[PDB]
């Protein structure tokens, strides 16, 4: 449940849209995105992360250290400034995202060849399901 290596494919996922007008994606943008295949590819060894989300027109990439505050600038989403932190919880790695928004971050479970995402901001959360490729 704490491995999660590998290339992850989309099953499902419910309030994207939500999530993102809560970070002021532009609603054009949107519209654009709720139909982009989104694939998640993860490269994890001990502590260090390197997290890759790619589409036909966007890419959301970021490294990090479980454990270790890092600047972030998420210059291909809402590009605002956030002091970001990934830490287990359990079984559950947890990103919270201090910024202008409250409860924003992002929550996986990872069970066997699943992988269950929660992206939060504000009042909304987006519920993602992937399976291992
Ligand atoms: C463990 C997963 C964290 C994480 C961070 C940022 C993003 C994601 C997952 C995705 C794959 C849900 C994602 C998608 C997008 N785009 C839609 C607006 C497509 C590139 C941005 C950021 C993240």
């Known amino acids: 449940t704490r491995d999660a290596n590998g290339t992850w494919e989309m099953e499902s996922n419910e309030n994207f849209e939500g999530w993102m007008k809560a970070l002021d994606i532009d609603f054009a943008l949107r519209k654009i995105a709720v139909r982009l295949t989104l694939t998640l590819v993860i490269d994890q060894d001990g502590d260090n992360f390197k997290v890759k989300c790619t589409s036909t027109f966007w890419n959301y990439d970021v490294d990090f250290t479980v454990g ?15 002091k970001a932190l990934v830490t287990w919880e359990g079984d559950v790695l947890v990103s919270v995202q201090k910024g202008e928004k409250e409860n924003r971050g992002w929550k996986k479970w990872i069970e066997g060849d699943k ?10 959360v987006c519920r993602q399901v992937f399976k291992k490729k």
């Open 68 to 82: 270790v505050e890092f600047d972030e600038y998420t210059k291909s989403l809402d590009n605002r400034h956030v």
């Open 115 to 124: 992988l269950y995402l929660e992206l939060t901001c504000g009042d909304q």
